[PDB]
Amino acid sequence: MEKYCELIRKRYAEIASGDLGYVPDALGCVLKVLNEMAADDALSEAVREKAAYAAANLLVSDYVNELEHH
Amino acid sequence: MEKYCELIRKRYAEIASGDLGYVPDALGCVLKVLNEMAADDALSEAVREKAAYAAANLLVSDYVNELEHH
């Protein structure tokens, strides 16, 4: 937990405490956000690429059934 | 796979084909990128928050041992 920036640590504490809700489909949640960023022309190409690669790598991994997760 | 943007589908095909490398720690890879974005003052606060929330949610989920991953 220590390696994460302040904002992630804050929001982690808030999900855990019930100040924020929790999304049980946690892999789906990360894929949704990474997909939005990858597609966001308002973001730099470097940022879009970083998001895209992490998403693609997760899909090709065995953590997700990339055809049928959602 | 169909719901993802073109960039993610392209990079997925490239990891799968060997035009790009693969990162076996796929959950670590998504957490690293989300953490970089969450901390990036060059990105809008809305974008930072979307990245932070998805990362925090993944950490609190049981997909990752958030203290001891990596």
Swiss-Prot record, chains A, B:
InterPro entries from the UniProt entry: UPF0253
Domain of life: Bacteria
Family: Belongs to the UPF0253 family.
Protein's UniProt name: UPF0253 protein YaeP
Species for this entry: Shigella flexneri
Lineage: Bacteria, Pseudomonadati, Pseudomonadota, Gammaproteobacteria, Enterobacterales
